Design a protein around this ligand. Structure first.
Ligand SMILES: N[C@@H](CCC(=O)N[C@@H](CS)C(=O)NCC(=O)O)C(=O)O
Ligand SMILES: N[C@@H](CCC(=O)N[C@@H](CS)C(=O)NCC(=O)O)C(=O)O
Lengths: 206, 205
C-alpha cells in the first residue's frame, strides 16, 4: 500500500488539485498543513524551498503541476492517450499563464500584497478571464461528454472547476456570459466523492 | 508520423521541441513565421499563440506540453512516471525562473526598454543564484551527469540551451558554478545536438 504525504499551507491554493485527486481515487493520504513558523523549519530541506511537495513512500516531488499530473497518471485521470494527456497538459499550462496574469488582482483581495481592488478587477481580472474562458468555451463546445478533453474526467477538469468555484466567492459576477463554464463547474463538482470532499475539507478562503 | 512545428523565426520556447526531433533523428516541418503570417493563422490556434505542434493534423499548443509529449514518444522523458514527474518539476522551476527574469530578458534582447544594469544585478543574478543552487543540488546528486536518472531527458535540453543563450548577453553567467558549465558542455557535446546547433538558423535568442 503506497503511502502519500502532501505538505502545503493551511489553504486550498495550488495543493487542492492533488487533494481532489486523492478523494476521487478513494486514496488515504497524509494531508500536512503548515504555518509560517513550521514552513521555515522544513523549507531548507525541500527540493526548491517551496510547497506543495508530494512524498511517495519517502521520495519527495515538488511543483503542483508535476504532482497533479503524476497522481493523475497513477489513478487514471490523465487522459486515455499520450496526446490527450498532452492536450490536458496544455490546458493546465494555459491556466497557469492565466494565474500569472491575474496575480496582481488575486494577491490583493486575499491580502498578501498591497493594491486597489476595483480597477484591478475591471482592468486586469475580467480581461484575462474573457480571453481564458474564450479558449475554455471553445474546448467545451468541442466536447460532447462535457469534460474539457476526451470523454472522461481529467485532472484539469478539477483545476478549472475549483478555480471558478473559488473566484465566485470574491467576484460573484464571474460566470455571467459563460453558461458552458458554469455547467462544467457544476458537472465536475457534482461528482459525489468530490462533493463529499468539498463538504468535509477545512473551510479556508482560497 | 508527420510532425509540423510552428513558431517565430527564433529559438525561444520552440527550440526545446526542435532539439528533441534532432536527437530522435526525426524529420519534421519547421515553420518559422513573421508578424504578418502569424496574424493570419493566430485565430485558428488553440490559445492564439505559438509554439504549436501538429501531429498528423492534430494541433497541440504550449511548449512544456509539446516537449513532454515528444519526449515520451522518443524516450527522453524519464524511465518511470516518478522520474518523469521529477523531470517535470525541474522544467516548471525553470519556467518560474523565466517569469522572474522576464523584466531583464526582454530588456537585453530589446523587445522592451528598461534599466539594464540594475535589472542585471538586482533581478537576474539573484534569480540565477537561487535557481543554480537547486540545479547544482541535482547535479551533485547525479553520478551520470544528467539532471535526473542515468540518461538524457528533455529538461537537460531546456537548461543547456538557456545557459548557452544567456552567455551571449551575460558572459559572466556561469562563474561560480562549474557543475552547470560542465552540464551545458556534456549535453551540447552530443553529436546529433551539436550538429543541430551547427546547422540551425543563427538567430540571437
Ligand atoms: N509553481 C510553484 C509555486 C509554488 C509556490 O510559489 N509556493 C508558495 C506558496 S504562497 C510558497 O512556497 N511561498 C513561500 C515563499 O517561498 O515565500 C508550484 O505551484 O508548486
Ligand atoms: N506559455 C506559452 C507562451 C507562448 C508565447 O509566449 N507565445 C508568444 C511568443 S512572443 C506569442 O505567441 N506571441 C504573439 C501573440 O500571441 O500575439 C509557451 O511558452 O508555451
Amino acid at each position: 500500500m503506497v503511502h502519500y504525504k502532501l505538505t502545503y499551507f493551511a489553504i486550498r491554493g495550488a495543493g487542492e488539485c492533488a487533494r481532489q485527486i486523492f478523494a476521487l481515487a478513494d486514496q488515504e493520504f497524509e494531508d500536512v498543513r503548515l504555518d509560517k513558523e513550521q514552513f521555515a523549519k522544513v523549507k531548507p530541506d525541500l527540493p526548491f524551498g517551496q510547497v506543495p511537495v508530494l512524498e511517495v513512500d519517502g521520495k519527495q516531488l515538488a511543483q503542483s503541476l508535476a504532482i497533479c499530473r503524476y497522481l493523475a497518471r497513477q489513478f487514471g485521470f490523465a487522459g486515455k492517450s499520450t496526446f490527450d494527456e498532452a492536450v490536458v497538459d496544455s490546458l493546465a499550462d494555459q491556466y497557469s499563464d492565466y494565474r500569472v496574469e491575474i496575480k496582481s488582482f488575486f494577491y490583493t483581495v486575499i491580502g498578501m500584497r498591497e493594491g486597489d481592488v476595483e480597477q484591478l478587477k475591471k482592468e486586469v481580472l475580467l480581461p484575462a478571464r474573457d480571453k481564458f474562458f474564450g479558449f475554455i468555451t471553445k474546448f467545451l463546445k468541442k466536447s460532447p461528454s462535457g469534460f474539457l478533453v476526451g470523454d472522461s474526467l481529467t485532472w484539469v477538469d478539477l483545476l478549472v472547476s475549483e478555480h471558478n468555484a473559488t473566484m465566485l466567492t470574491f467576484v460573484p459576477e464571474f460566470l455571467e456570459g459563460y453558461p458552458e463554464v458554469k455547467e462544467h463547474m457544476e458537472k465536475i463538482r457534482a461528482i459525489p466523492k468530490l462533493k463529499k470532499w468539498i463538504e468535509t475539507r477545512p473551510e479556508t478562503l482560497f
